[model samples]
Target: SFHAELQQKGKNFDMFAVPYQQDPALALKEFRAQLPIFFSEAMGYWIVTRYEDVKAIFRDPITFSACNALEKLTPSCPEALKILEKYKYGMNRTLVNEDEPVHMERRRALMDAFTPQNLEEHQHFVRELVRKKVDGFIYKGRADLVQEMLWEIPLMVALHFLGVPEDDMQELRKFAVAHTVNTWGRPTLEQQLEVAEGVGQFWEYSGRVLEKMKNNPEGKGWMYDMIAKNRVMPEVVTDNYLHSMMMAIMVAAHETTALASANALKLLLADRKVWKKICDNPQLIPGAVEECLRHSGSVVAWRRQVTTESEVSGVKFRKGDKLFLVSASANHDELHFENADELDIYRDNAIEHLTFGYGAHQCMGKNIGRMEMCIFIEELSRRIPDLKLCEQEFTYLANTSFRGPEALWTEWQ
Candidate 1:
């Protein structure tokens, strides 16, 4: 009845509930058509679904400030806040949430690491790593791909890219999950307390890693490059920004790619012909990765806060308002993407999807992610072309934004 009332009032949306859990894009198809923008009392934000509106908000970073980009959707309890205080968790803005001028300046300084020429060198490492991983399980005839390969490879690559030592990987994985749960997922008070403790430790851990990197500033990888930049331009690449991104980028750099790779495999194998098509023509893997990202990207939505009053799709908004830009729904918008729901690897404009945000604050590591996804698909299709999805109930962590199955089981003969 409450849901009916909310719908009748034209304000019904809860990202953690039913249909969204099943399929975010199709779940919001109805709303995307009629109510592209609506205020959700339940969410305390304007839920923006249409392709144009989401892209517009991402395009205009100043008006739609990303200050709240990393804000915990569910408020941290007082106890949780106390735990964070104990750890001195003062996560200032990293590039994603940082405001303009400084954001652009810092991005420019750090942009060298993400250059195609720079990333070209890293491709060999990714290709080698994927081949080795497939080698480990190809003969076993069955595997939980997420656990066996998908999860760790991206994390390992992330650490290598960030110049962090891969000593405490198991702990880092736990911390990444805790950070995701705390930031994006709705948790019970009890779960909140536990997540708070983990996040506190994560913050502390990030600081220690930054300190170590500081000692060896000449080291390889992006963070080391950042450390060098910070020394030269302390004002632009501030101390807190390094620490904040150290933690944030760990999750950002690895988890999304890991999840995207898993989601792509799951989607392609669901339609065996698509899998076979790519196996026959390796060139198709790149386009397929783009299509898969559009069809079912790991990052379903992103947050933005209003600094200047604005309206989207004729809906009025004021300063300090919050927006949930559902890019997953945008990727499915027929206006922008023809037959947006279908998983067509041949789609010409699939690369234009807002899964990576858009314009200024778009993902810096986007190509790295694309390269990893393409490599994973290429290696898997080449090595285990007969891979088949094992029948099982797919489960996802209960979160509003980032998404992927908990495990993807596959078998080959």
Candidate 2:
């Protein structure tokens, strides 16, 4: 039915398919140029590809509610559901999906953890961590950057920032991938069972950590801050928010930054001239990071559910409609970004990319990501200026939102 409709309408877009999974912005370029809003039969959502529309939907969170922001893309199998139920997986609303008034209230309560003063204190350690990582692997002729450095450092940093213990980091890495696949990837029944088991354990792990944190209420970091806020403003902070965010924020903050850093290094090193320019002058690192994010970001798409009749870019959307806002497509939309396909580190408005989203629900931990990328680039370029991409086929986890190479192999002489 919808397939026939799509064939008759002539829209070729599938989120789980290879074209999109490999390069979202490039995959949807035609859609952004032609039909910016069209229903995707494959994903059962209205795919919005243009910058203006995506930004508008993000800006007006009232009309376009975030209720389904964290909802799974693929339906859970009966067997998978049972596994999730067995572990009592109860992932619920966190800051990213919360509604108005209360969302703002909670955001304000937790805003202190992200302030410059607080973030500055986190910087010294993050820089030290990056330097140590580079020192560990620099002497090796070849290194899979993602494995040796990119993947673990950000998770450690996120654990530190969130006040979560990092005893089982390698296991956490496996859990994060499972969560991504369970939430966004279309895993088969067999894979779903494995993903369900992993997700279930993650849920239990998150709960245990939160209980332990309760014992030491005066502990530092964002989760501790949330715990303190929950004590005074339980309703706004909410018990459910803490438990859900405990699991979600770990992957949210860690995976995104890790992938973004990997993406930045890949892009810079691919263009030897651009890499050389940044290596020659470290002042360009920030803009280079921003441009890389615009060109190729970790999170390429995000979800929204319509609450009321709303219009985006002259297209009327009825209530209960699902929207897959492709920020990667929007970032490359020539309507706003001139020469949108080109990678220019000096792109004046590069920072305007919707990778972190926009308006009320914009990523709260955005600076943390930017800081990590800058430090990673700075340390890598300064120490191993001659780093070159090794010959290898890059692979990515097939998902709608988060993206990065599974292994960014590089060699330096």
Candidate 3:
């Protein structure tokens, strides 16, 4: 039924636009204009553009299911779904796509593992890792920020958190990046299989690590403790479950932060006033990160399926209608934010951005994401206070669901 609308619109609408993907402000402007609205032939679903409407759907999940959204949003290939199911590991149980008691239970377990105290305890490690990566470029006088610095820092932190050995960092980084890009967007069959294979390998690796921790649980590693405790109440913390969670964490921890970091630099470099504001007042780095998130968040859009007939933003919708929530658009909504279009580093209300979603299903790694970006900006400014972009070029991923630069090339002095 939706295919007809897709066919009619797909003929006229060019879905892929590099500028729209990289610049959220531009995308929001285009959405507000309502250039064209249509169901996706690739995903077999409808997409929404308005900010308030999108948020209402995300906030009211009881009437909008997440699991169905995933199923519908994913590629139509049955083989791809089968591969995902097999390799989904803990993702099959992770809270992002789950509902009710199961989601609550997993969330509790993860909260215990990734608490504020836990994050603080690991702050030194995270900071050190960021510093090490930055040091590599400080002497070079020029570097590709995204590839040389941003991507490595988060992956290293994630690997450290997982207790992954340094010897395997390179392989793990490639695997993590590959799987993340594959899962976040629509990929070819070969790419899907590659991700599925990586999932299988990671699952096996996780099983081995769990066993090792089980045998010698002396280390202070969280995985060791999780394995030692063997708390299986939710049935999502099993070895398989941990593997799925690790995969999800690996992707979420790395890709989103990488994009945010790149986006932050892009924004600051383009607006000299914003850059000057941050340099003049270092205290604004944290707020600047929040503003960057509001202005150009990593995740472009996410969807929710209605479970009951309801009305959102004065639009009627029946159960089973998939609503795509444009987080970047919501972050820039004039009704919710002052100077929503302008980049204000010192804006007091910058943290209110919905880039991380809201309500019950907010990102589990929000704090960590913020910490990573803050440390990155702080360290970059400290090392290269005079840093400025040169010969900049960006390639945005084709996936509409995820907003990120695939390659950010910029010379810095």
Candidate 4:
């Protein structure tokens, strides 16, 4: 009965497909109507949808392990693993997945970089950069905003914030996508070998950056401070941990921010009233940004492994079970957000969205990402209030973890 009922032949109900039709929130709702949580033999995991349940699971790091976090969502074949091994793929124990006392120690030491007082300086730089980007396209009347503006600035700001030079951004961007694919995308054997080479190059590049940073121990910013911590507190901050974090920070700093900003813009433009609402009252940009994160966050889901027997909202899964916490659904749960499907710029509780994630592993670069996103919405709305969405189908990369349009086309009078 379970096999027959669980979308055995329904095309529209295939949750695994990239860029699923209808809001992902709705897809989760459909699944919940049949089963709140069920083990999928195909996925080799459990799928959880309820808002409260999702929070509970993420809130406890020990019970629900993030050991599988950067694990290849699609199991790499032996040939693929061999190629990846040849490239020296050794991603592990970054802040996002590091367990217990070490994670707390490192996170506390690194908190200074994310403090509001510390971030004010970053906010000013981001605002100025955003203006320069807007100036380039404000009079042009049309642009693939991602390529022209949204794409470059966050990366520039991220490198500067990390205290890494922006000279290799082109190479960085190329392999950043490479890393996402090798880990998140379901590349075939042919594609995996090619991706392995790019990942190898990036690993080599990160090592060079570390070597250079090691030369100057007193430099400013998080990466430098991190290296110092590694020196002063070797057990708490090992070289292995530093290398993993250095690579992870590069992607975490820029990609999430860029994609979320693009998703926010797309959501607002889809509802002209919402766009106009932000334009009319610049103060509302924060609320609108929050609301948009709820509706269309670029990071749709995350993976977790069950370390012990567990029950989430009355559904049980045994030890060693893998599961995806579908944030897209939880953010849209009507029980938590009234009229969850509707995008209301005036939504009072919009900031409660799960886009930045929840609990211990919640994103560290969140405010930096938000500052860039806020400035983008404010500057563009202030300069070009008469913007319109170009009539075209949205295209997204076919990946399970990250979700963002490849190009966001916009036109203004």
Candidate 5:
């Protein structure tokens, strides 16, 4: 049976495809029962499935190094590397990729922007933007939610938050998507070369933007604050840190939350009762947001490398062993969550889900994402409580890490 399964599927016993294409909830439940940690040569990582094991690995970052945290899962060829080197593609250790002392130092220094007060102020801007977006199509009765609202709002918010110069949102989105594929997907050599060209330009363009921000020095945004901090404390926030962070955060701030919001809205619309409950009791919006994050986070898998020989929940791995902790799978582990496959917005432990990660390197922008999601849900439940999912097929970008639909059509009375 195993041999037959391998033959029918691609060479590496394709778990990513099987779960994604078919009934993911069932597929994950079955896989967690049997293959908790299995290596795939084709995919180049030991994929971890269970909740306990994944959580353990995340908690002990010293044992499992995050040095190459953002390393390209689908590696590039010599041609691709050459193309990258041509434009000096040096996206080395930004905040996510940085280690112990340095990571802590930088995170502490730059912690002011994500504070409750700062982020609370952003909610006004978010509410205003969302209201304008709603105005665009509120009377239409039917609309593509992703196109009309979810897509542009988050990107604009991210750019506004970062204080990056206003050029073109579409162009910046292309850069973000290209960066996602270049770092996360396995593209053909031709595809890799094409991606490297765009990635290269994104790098150069971001540097120029950084210089512009540095010159002004009085701007009031995350990037501007980072630049000022860099001047005061060069070691913690280096020039390289400024440029690389600007490039990375551009995507991180926008793409993850945008996909997450779309997924939350899609999943909620799919379940009328759940939507009705939240619509009726708006106070439950925060808990509903947590459940949505657990059910449909954009980042499906996260990367970690073994710094020394270590055994994770009975499985032994060598010093160089790389781990692909399928956070999506862990979130659905029946061992951890009751009715793990079903969506329960009232599940008290929904916040315990492993989507934003654990330990020191957990996503700082997590609350930013959550705030946007909560506001989106609150506004949506109030205004479009009767919104129903339209009869159209949904499609996702052909990538592994990010998970969300390209468009979500909906109609209401």
Candidate 6:
């Protein structure tokens, strides 16, 4: 019936945009007004907008499932699914997309590594990494922030956490970036297969890392503990599972954080007042990161499946239907946030934004992500006192699923 109405409008209300999957903000706005509407014929699925409704569904995972999200991912373009299948190491075992009990157990096993105590212990390392990278480009007068700075910092931090050598970072970074790009856009089947093969290679590398830890399990590191104690529930923990977790961490930690950092930098530079505000009170950098995550969140939406017929905000969803909780739109909802459309670094409630998601599926690396972002902005301010954009025009990743800049060029005195 809703489809009929959309069709009757002669595709005027056709919210579905093809080949431009990355920027769904416009469509998400329409969905918010309509509530639980379907954007058929692209991927042929439903997108759940509206902050309350999306949050409700995210909270109630039992009724609205996550397994279907991955199941519904058919290879729309060449090599897409195959590539995803190939690089299935960490993604294959990611606990975030799984259903209860299993997801919970896996999350618990990984939780020890991300504890507040652990983060505090590693805070200085994070600050030094941020400072080093910022200093490298501060005097250069110009730089592509995304490539020159953003990507490496997060990747290096992830490597540190995994006890992997920094020298091994470049290959891993390439694979992670490629995997993310492939997931976002339509590539030839060949491209898909290449990415898939790369996935395999990455997993193989992870396996070796795990194997090394097994032999010399004296590091007292998180990886060592996971291997030595072996306290994780067997149902959820396997070598393959551990590899998948590691790979997912690498990609997730690197790509999303990098993109957010880049986007936030672009936004701040564009708005001099915001930049001045941060420059005046460096403490606001943490809040600025939260606002950036809310204003230009790295993810377009998170996927979930309908296990049973359910009504959200008076709209009904059928069994087996897929739901996309558009986080970016929710972050911009006027009802939940005052001046939702504007970016306010001083917003008191900015942390409530759904960029990292909510409920059980909330991003596991959020603390690390926050730490990376804060250190980045703080260091950038201290180093590049007059950093500004070189060109107003820039390109972003085409994939609507993940939001990020392809390249960000800037100049500073």
**Model 4 TM:** 0.94
TM-score of 2: 0.96
RMSD of each candidate? 1.9, 2.2, 4.1, 2.2, 2.2, 3.4
Ranking according to lDDT, highest score first: 1, 2, 5, 4, 6, 3
Clashes of 4: 0
The candidate with the higher lDDT, 2 or 6, is: 2
* lDDT (Cα atoms) of all candidates against the true structure: 0.88, 0.88, 0.66, 0.79, 0.82, 0.70
User: Which ten-residue region of model 3 has the weakest summed lDDT?
Assistant: 67-76
Point out where model 3 deviates above 4 Å.
1-25, 28-30, 33-42, 68-73, 76-91, 189-192, 214-216, 219-240, 410-413
| Residues 110-220, model 3: lDDT tens digits | 545676788896778889887777777677757777778777777777666655555576777666655555555656666776766665666556556656656775666
Q: What's each prediction's TM-score?
A: 0.97, 0.96, 0.84, 0.94, 0.94, 0.88
* Greater-lDDT candidate between 2 and 3: 2
lDDT of 5 by residue, 284-384 (tens): 88898899888788877788899889897777999889888888889899899998878898999999998898887888889989989988888888998
Clashing pairs in 4: none
**Clashing residue pairs found in predicted model 1:** none
Looking at candidate 1, the ten consecutive residues that score lowest on lDDT are 2-11
TM-score rank order = 1, 2, 5, 4, 6, 3
Clash count per candidate: 0, 0, 3, 0, 0, 7
| lDDT for residue 234 in candidate 2, whole number 0-100 | 87
